[PDB]
Amino acid sequence: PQITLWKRPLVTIKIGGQLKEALLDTGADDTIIEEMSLPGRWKPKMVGGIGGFIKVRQYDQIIIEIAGHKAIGTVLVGPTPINIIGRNLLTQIGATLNF
Amino acid sequence: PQITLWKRPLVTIKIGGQLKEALLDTGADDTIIEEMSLPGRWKPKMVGGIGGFIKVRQYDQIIIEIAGHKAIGTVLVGPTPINIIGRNLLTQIGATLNF
Numbered sequence: 001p002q003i004t005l006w007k008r009p010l011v012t013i014k015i016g017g018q019l020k021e022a023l024l025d026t027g028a029d030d031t032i033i034e035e036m037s038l039p040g041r042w043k044p045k046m047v048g049g050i051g052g053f054i055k056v057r058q059y060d061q062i063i064i065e066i067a068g069h070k071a072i073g074t075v076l077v078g079p080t081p082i083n084i085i086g087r088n089l090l091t092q093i094g095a096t097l098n099f
Numbered sequence: 100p101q102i103t104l105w106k107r108p109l110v111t112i113k114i115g116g117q118l119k120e121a122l123l124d125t126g127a128d129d130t131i132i133e134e135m136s137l138p139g140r141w142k143p144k145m146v147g148g149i150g151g152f153i154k155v156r157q158y159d160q161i162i163i164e165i166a167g168h169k170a171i172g173t174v175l176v177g178p179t180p181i182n183i184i185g186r187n188l189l190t191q192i193g194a195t196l197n198f
């Protein structure tokens with residue numbers, strides 16, 4: 001699709017067999033989702049945003065369905081105001097910005 | 100142009116007669132620029148994201164040239180770690196997210 005930006009670019013994602021809403025965020029380097037249980041071991045990671053840094057849990061090789069497109073990669077879990085799909089996954093689905 | 104997301108989508112902008120580098124951010128509702136002097140009255144506002152909230156000054160009807168494209172709208176000025184071009188101005192230049 002071609003998504004205009006008059007409204008927040010929200011899509012449905014499927015992760016852990018659950019359906020969730022997420023923001024397509026070109027300004028986020030990584031993908032961060034709200035607290036949920038994911039499989040595997042995690043590593044610590046410091047993530048910087050508008051108000052400073054936070055501590056999140058990094059899970060690798062996670063299967064995630066983004067607006068019907070399947071992707072497999074790194075997902076961070078932590079206290080985010082909204083589920084964000086960052087560049088790491090946007091590239092996997094071949095998303096670009098055009099103007 | 101067609102911007103791939105392997106790297107951060109930075110562009111050159113012109114605001115208040117100064118040249119700055121900024122992030123084309125679909126996850127940002129509004130544009131936020133690092134501390135600078137702008138003409139006009141302004142209203143204080145609080146903006147939040149990852150890491151909490153920052154206090155900014157809201158300037159209205161500011162003209163900004165985004166990669167050679169002139170646009171007009173609200174600009175928030177404050178202690179942001181990076182200059183962000185949000186949806187309020189991306190729409191004006193006809194930017195879309197495609198996949």
Ligand SMILES: CC(C)CN(C[C@@H](O)[C@H](Cc1ccccc1)NC(=O)O[C@H]1CCOC1)S(=O)(=O)c1ccc(N)cc1
Nearest residue numbers: 027028029030048049050124126127128129147148149
């Ligand atoms: C958190 C989302 C919902 C909103 N933010 C936009 C996001 O694109 C934000 C942009 C940014 C990049 C680098 C440093 C600081 C900020 N990236 C972000 O947090 O990157 C983290 C998450 C994964 O990788 C690192 S915002 O900055 O809080 C914001 C809020 C309101 C306005 N009007 C403008 C901006």
